[PDB]
Swiss-Prot record:
It comes from Staphylococcus aureus (strain Mu3 / ATCC 700698). Residues 53-76, 177-200 bind DNA. This is HTH-type transcriptional regulator SarS. It holds the Pfam family Staph_reg_Sar_Rot. One of its GO terms (molecular function) is DNA-binding transcription factor activity. SUPFAM superfamilies: Winged helix' DNA-binding domain.
């Protein structure tokens, strides 16, 4: 009861789910945020001992407003220092001394270990999963990139799209709502609302059994299958030849 296709959409679904599990287990046990670990990973992997802030804003998928504070946190904690631009004085440059690059390196080595240990304790079934900080960074950026594309070219949310894709790969087979909810990382509220909107718009059928009214059946008829197919096809095109798993490094 999974996404039965080996395209880039499958990549997103797998990674998005992995990131959910990772966050769930790690965020409570560690005081440094995941975004903070990713910023440090980025900063570690690049030669200049000094860079323009706008370079970080452009290289990663985070909005600038979501970076300003974590830079402050990283600064406050001596991982980096900030210098004002001598040209457009409203701009900023981040500097990394030999002493700071060392504090960063150890911190990224810790992240490497956290990822490794998580993978060992996790149902690491797929080969997709990040193996170290650099890979984690890239795959995390892919989920953000995938999501931006969804809201730019479609009217559906990324959750509704996930659900549509999963059901579409069932080739007309009937799926039970509770089997669907059990298989995905998304919770009941979000899932049901996604299905109700998908039904309403006409993407799929959501009906109840007539003898065992307890079961909620989800599936698509010929027409709907066809449309969904085209749709998954368009999206896969949009993500075509982009080195989606290496948007930042390598």
């Amino acid at each position: 009861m999974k996404y039965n296709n080996h395209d880039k959409i499958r990549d997103f679904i797998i990674i998005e789910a992995y990131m959910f599990r990772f966050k769930k287990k790690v965020k409570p046990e560690v005081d440094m945020t995941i975004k903070e670990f990713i910023l440090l990973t980025y900063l570690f992997h690049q030669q200049e001992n000094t860079l323009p802030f706008k370079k970080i804003v452009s290289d990663l998928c985070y909005k600038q407003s979501d970076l300003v504070q974590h830079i402050k946190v990283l600064v406050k904690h001596s991982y980096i220092s900030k210098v004002r631009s001598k040209i457009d004085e409203r701009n900023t440059y981040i500097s990394i001394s030999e002493e700071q690059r060392e504090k960063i390196a150890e911190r990224v080595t810790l992240f490497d270990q956290i990822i490794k240990q998580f993978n060992l304790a996790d149902q690491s079934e797929s080969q997709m999963i990040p193996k170290d900080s650099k890979e984690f960074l890239n795959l995390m950026m892919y989920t953000m990139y995938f999501k931006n594309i969804i809201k730019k070219h479609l009217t559906l949310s990324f959750v509704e799209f996930t659900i549509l894709a999963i059901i579409t790969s069932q080739n007309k087979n009937i799926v039970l709502l509770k089997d669907l909810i059990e298989t995905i990382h998304h919770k009941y509220p979000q899932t049901v609302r996604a299905l109700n909107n998908l039904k309403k718009q006409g993407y799929l059928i959501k009906e109840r059994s007539t003898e065992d009214e307890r079961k909620i059946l989800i599936h698509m008829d010929d027409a709907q299958q066809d449309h969904a197919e085209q749709l998954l096809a368009q999206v896969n095109q949009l993500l075509a030849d982009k080195d989606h798993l290496h948007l930042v490094f390598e």
